[PDB]
Design a binder for this molecule. Structure first.
Ligand SMILES: *[C@@H]1O[C@H](CO)[C@@H](O)[C@H](O)[C@H]1NC(C)=O
Ligand SMILES: *[C@@H]1O[C@H](CO)[C@@H](O)[C@H](O)[C@H]1NC(C)=O
Lengths: 54, 405, 400, 58
């Protein structure tokens, strides 16, 4: 119990749907589903922080 | 049946906000209709199949509909956008007065939103870009008609009205060069075509799905790309922060992937970060390097990395007997005071340059085939930088004593 | 009575305009207003354009023009209009004696002291800026990590999203930039001329620096060696850690360098495992010699997320190495270091360890000394045109 | 009386950094330092980590 982070970064930005985009990106890359994903976007780069166990 | 969207708007029909109707291009890539942002309503175009909305065109960006009431229709053979008080907020301003019936508005497969006659196109969105160049769109001049088609950024992420940044071709100089302006301030120089690529954007290159070209003929001076795989979306957009970028939708990333971004380097790309007669190099410190044969105009400033005044020749020129230093891998300097003869070559160019006591530098105009054409500069050399792996030769004139063989 | 001293009977108030001034007149400490709020802070006295290099109560603003800084009950405290404490030093001692004195030292250190010594120091609580003589990194005696947190914006000095911090629980101490909890850029290890991920930093005619790694501290410090020159390191609101030197002829704080320097290759892991970023190639991400992309279809569309893997399985005994040039060393989370042995001895040790995937010198001075060994995937790599360092990555003999 | 006025010109001073709280006056001081004269005024803008001085001169 209590979550861990899976980290996926690439060029570009969050946009208005970063969280959902990140969550899809995670699924495509792992064949699993995350609890949720945070997205932030400085330095012309999209940073997905995906909550996984653990 | 008839639930699904059409690609046509006839003279008797209309599109309204309250109806939620849209137009969809044949091939289903683009969708045109009303959208809401920043408390205002707008007519616009986006990619139909992407859940995240990407607006590639806005009709009335500086003329918002005040509220949820809006009506697009043909009026007196003209496309018009009416607000809640039946007042026109936007319209195509016709290029003919003897337009014949039937007049039809139509969204094409390539995203061109077009008003046409039985006689042909009367108006095209392709001629009035917002912040984005689509495949088949022309960036630059239509010479017969004087129309310069250029890009203007959204003011912000939410506000589509005309931003501070524009990306435009300027032909009032030796060579056509693209520039980025922030209002009236010249902030980045893409520079001339070379002609594989533009001098100041070395990342642009042919891809498995797109090819591009620059046409400079009697009819036009313009840039165009085509995407050769219909299922792939690529575009050029100047974003609200002033970066001109190629973006390609990449499914495996679930993102608009930036193939390149310009300016690419805060260090060397901003307009004239180094003064005259010097050049910027990302791998040296200081960034600004005096041209071979030149010295800093103010050394104390130069050592403090104040490069504003630039550099000057160590030795006065004597015209006859002068030589050249060959600079490698260069972004050619700004061509305001430059001339071009594309039909002659490098040797003929040196001769012409030598013979002219005002010529301070020369270069090829085209890099294909081992290089052709002649470009000649007079006066100060501005906005230079080099590259590790791209760019071009530039010969800068020096007095005999300062030449290396 | 000093211009740099505040006794228990004295005070600074907003309305009195009273300030503290460092010996030698470089710094001034007092109240200033921004974003409609009042703050106690420190700036360069002799510069007309105001540069706040330290703010005491950045997350606890005074709402209005009434405020008082003073020693109260042997404590430094900031009182609002209703004589209520809005900020204070929460003291580290129990038997403090009089006189308790607050004092601005020549180096901009704002200090609360006893007859027995320092009780509190601003140098231990930086805002967004490292000044000369300040320590960036760990105090091992106390376990306190001194790090930088940016202003939220140009006008709002409250704790922004960006922090610049040292982490030492790994092979070598490494600096990182975080945006909230997100790891956004990795400055990396000391080499020890410079840090791996900031190639522009170098000794200057007016400043020298070093990285001390001993029993008492793991921290970075620079000194400015010309008293008439101001230089500083600041992480700005946009998240760039920069060296700034005030240049009169430019009338500006001149950026000597800015990190991250390249949006293309510097962001944390823009390229996947077993690959590296190169600003002069297309794609930006290049498989390591002897490696191939894990997913070709993604790789051709410049999706480099999955990275690369070895073309040929390792056989431990008999394996070789490919020598990568001009590299930013990969992250050293799963790395070990042996400073006593050298490159030759390091390779052997690596060869003999079947889990070892790469190695490098720990210091680049003097032709290189020391041994650094990695296991597992190599992450967050990029190269440079003219800087960086040799890295040896393990391959099966056939690919060597 | 009614003669043609002198034509207005723009002088450009760009460098790393930003405008700041007093960009205009900084640019103007920068100009004076560089030319030994006074400009009518200076605009300042700051994208691309660069301070652009646009100085109105005769
Ligand atoms: C997501 O964001 C929230 C809000 O700041 C934070 O508490 C949480 O730790 C984040 N999760 C991850 C995976 O970083
Ligand atoms: C300065 O900005 C003003 C105000 O927007 C503008 O009208 C003017 O043309 C600019 N001047 C220069 C020298 O660019």
């Amino acid at each position: 119990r209590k979550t861990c982070v899976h980290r996926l970064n690439s060029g570009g930005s969050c946009g208005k749907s970063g969280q959902h985009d990140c969550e899809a990106f995670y699924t495509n890359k792992t064949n699993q589903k995350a609890f949720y994903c945070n997205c932030t976007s400085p330095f012309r780069t999209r940073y997905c922080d995906c909550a996984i166990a653990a | 049946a008839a639930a699904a969207a059409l690609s046509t708007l006839s003279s008797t029909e209309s599109l309204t906000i309250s109806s939620n109707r849209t137009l969809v291009s044949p091939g289903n890539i683009f969708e045109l209709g009303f959208f809401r942002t920043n408390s205002r309503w707008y007519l616009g175009m986006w990619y139909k199949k992407l859940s995240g909305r990407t607006y590639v065109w806005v009709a009335n960006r500086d003329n918002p509909l005040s509220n949820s009431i809006g009506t697009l229709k043909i009026s007196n053979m003209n496309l018009v956008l009416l607000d809640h008080s039946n007042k026109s907020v936007w319209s195509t301003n016709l290029t003919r007065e003897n337009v014949r019936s039937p007049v039809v508005a139509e969204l094409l497969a390539n995203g061109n939103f077009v008003v046409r006659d039985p006689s042909g196109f009367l108006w095209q969105s392709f001629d009035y870009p917002t912040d984005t160049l689509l495949p088949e769109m022309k960036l630059g001049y239509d010479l017969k008609t004087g129309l310069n088609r250029f890009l203007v950024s959204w003011r912000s992420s939410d506000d589509p009205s005309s931003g501070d940044f524009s990306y435009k071709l300027d032909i009032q100089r030796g060579l056509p060069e693209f520039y980025t302006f922030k209002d009236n301030t010249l902030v980045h120089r893409t520079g001339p075509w070379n002609g594989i690529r533009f001098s100041g954007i070395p990342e642009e290159q042919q891809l498995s799905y797109m090819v591009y070209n620059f046409t400079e003929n009697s009819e036009e001076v313009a840039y165009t790309f085509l995407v050769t795989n219909n299922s792939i979306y690529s575009r050029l957009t100047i974003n609200f922060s002033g970066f001109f970028e190629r973006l390609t939708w990449t499914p495996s990333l679930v993102i608009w992937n930036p193939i390149w971004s310009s300016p690419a380097s805060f260090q060397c790309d901003p307009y004239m970060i180094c003064g005259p007669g010097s050049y910027c190099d990302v791998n040296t410190l200081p960034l600004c390097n005096c041209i071979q044969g030149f010295k800093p105009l103010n050394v104390q400033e130069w050592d403090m990395r104040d490069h504003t005044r630039g550099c000057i020749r160590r030795t006065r020129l004597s015209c006859r007997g002068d030589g050249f230093t060959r600079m490698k891998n260069m972004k050619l300097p700004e061509t305001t005071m430059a001339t071009v003869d594309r039909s002659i070559g490098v040797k003929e160019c040196e001769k012409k340059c030598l013979s002219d006591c005002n010529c301070t530098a020369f270069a090829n105009a085209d890099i294909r085939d081992g290089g052709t054409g002649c470009v000649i500069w007079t006066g100060r050399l501005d906005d230079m930088r080099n590259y590790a792996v791209s760019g071009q030769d530039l010969y800068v004139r020096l007095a005999a004593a300062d030449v290396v063989e």
